[PDB]
Design a protein around this ligand. Structure first.
Ligand SMILES: [Cl-]
Length: 181
């Protein structure tokens, strides 16, 4: 059926917008099919997501979904008119260079199309922590010349939880810059 992903309850739904960027991170919002397995306190639907954005006084311009495990919500069912992009980030290996570029291109393609806006890119994985943290920091390091420990620190502060995966951290810090021509 619809199962609650491991440790999904153990994370703050929505982080703080990262100042100096247009990134915001959160754990997957869950469809109503999931809510029969959640106490109403544990609930976090896409509606709640859009409230928490509006309550922080921002608005979403793009949603990048990194998850693959289950249908968590349908983009069509969103309190919507925010464009959606799926970028499957699978397994525990450092996200591959192909995924890293899909992410950069989407973020780049978004900022040029919205340089007038302060509309945000909302990125989410299952917990909005590990895969999300990697990709956000990888972009900041590569594109914005932010040094690793600074990007990690910023992501962690705004998220409410520290990035966990040691191999992600190691790559952020000592791994090479992913360049293309
Ligand atoms: Cl997933």
């Amino acid at each position: 059926g619809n199962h609650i992903p491991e440790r999904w309850k153990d994370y703050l739904p929505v982080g703080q917008r990262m100042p100096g960027t247009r990134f915001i991170a959160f754990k997957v919002p869950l469809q109503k099919s999931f809510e029969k397995k959640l106490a109403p306190e544990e609930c976090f639907s896409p509606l709640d997501l859009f409230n928490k954005i509006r309550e922080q006084n921002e608005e979403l311009g793009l949603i990048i979904d990194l998850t693959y495990t289950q249908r968590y919500y349908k983009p069509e069912d969103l309190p919507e008119t925010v464009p959606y992009l799926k970028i499957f980030t699978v397994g525990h290996q450092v996200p591959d260079d192909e995924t890293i570029f899909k992410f950069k291109h989407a973020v780049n393609g978004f900022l040029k199309e919205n340089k007038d806006n302060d509309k945000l890119i909302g990125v989410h994985s299952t917990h909005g922590l590990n895969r999300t943290g990697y990709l956000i920091c990888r972009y900041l390091i590569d594109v914005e010349g932010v040094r690793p420990d600074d990007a990690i620190e910023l992501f962690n502060r705004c998220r409410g939880h520290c990035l966990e995966r040691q191999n992600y951290i190691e790559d952020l810090q000592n791994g090479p810059i992913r360049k293309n021509w």
